[PDB]
Design a protein around this ligand. Structure first.
Ligand SMILES: [Mg+2]
Length: 258
């Protein structure tokens, strides 16, 4: 048995629902679907959004209504979920689900966008720092870990269409890219790069100026695993053609212990 995980920053769950979300979900049939940018009070949702037959759903909203928020649909419920790193300023923005499954912990993370200001940038970097503390503790415990979501940073030049013009733009700052380097050096693997070494492989395009059509995009969304688990990763891919958000979904297929 394999387990398929999809991660998708949906740019608002209500928004994506109006653009083919449930048809896609039913057709893709992931075992686990991690979503970011729900932008909805979980109670405000129609029961066919938050209920999808065959899945347990778990929603982790921000304190601020209509902002941020993550969600997980899973056929098999986790033994529990954590909704934070145990650090209150990173825990109230609806960015964190850490779901405890059998073979592994699944971090479903909506990493902060650092573009709006220097405060938001510091926020993002410290969020990164607290994330790294969290995940290291868990896999140091002996947990195999899968981390997915919107990292809001393109790692290397290959990871976006315009590395030069974005050198001093949050998303592609040396400091941000250096964090992913450090993250990787702690024994985590960017799984997409395990199987696909190609350029032009992105997960986000600006809605504007035909960015998706000109493939002017960034790979902002990732699946990382710890080194010790990478042997279990069978596939890691971008669902490039799936529409309805400014991000496309990304996929991970892993093989379960019998
Ligand atoms: Mg958005």
């Amino acid at each position: 048995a394999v387990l398929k995980i999809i991660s998708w920053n949906v740019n608002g769950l209500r928004a994506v629902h109006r653009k083919g979300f449930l048809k896609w979900f039913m057709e893709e049939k992931p075992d686990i679907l991690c979503l970011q940018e729900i932008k909805a009070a979980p109670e405000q949702l129609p029961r066919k959004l938050r209920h999808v037959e065959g899945y347990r759903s778990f929603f982790t909203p921000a304190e601020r209504k209509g902002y941020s928020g993550v969600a997980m649909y899973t056929k098999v419920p986790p033994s529990s979920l954590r909704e934070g790193f145990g650090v209150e300023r990173f825990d109230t923005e609806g960015r964190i689900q850490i779901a405890d499954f059998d073979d592994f912990l699944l971090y479903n993370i909506y990493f902060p966008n650092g573009k709006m200001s220097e405060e938001r940038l510091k926020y993002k970097l410290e969020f990164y720092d607290a994330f790294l503390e969290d995940v290291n503790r868990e896999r140091d415990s002996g947990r195999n870990v899968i981390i997915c979501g919107d990292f809001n940073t393109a790692h290397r030049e290959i990871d976006l269409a315009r590395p030069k013009e974005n050198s001093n733009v949050s998303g592609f700052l040396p400091v941000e890219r250096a964090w992913i380097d450090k993250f990787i050096e702690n024994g985590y693997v960017d799984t997409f790069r395990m199987f696909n070494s190609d350029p032009g492989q992105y997960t986000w395009w600006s809605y504007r100026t035909r960015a998706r059509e000109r493939n002017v995009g960034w790979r902002l969304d990732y699946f990382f695993v710890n080194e010790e688990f990478k042997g279990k990763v069978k596939r890691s891919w971008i669902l490039s053609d799936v529409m309805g958000s400014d991000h496309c979904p990304i996929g991970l297929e892993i093989e379960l212990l019998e």
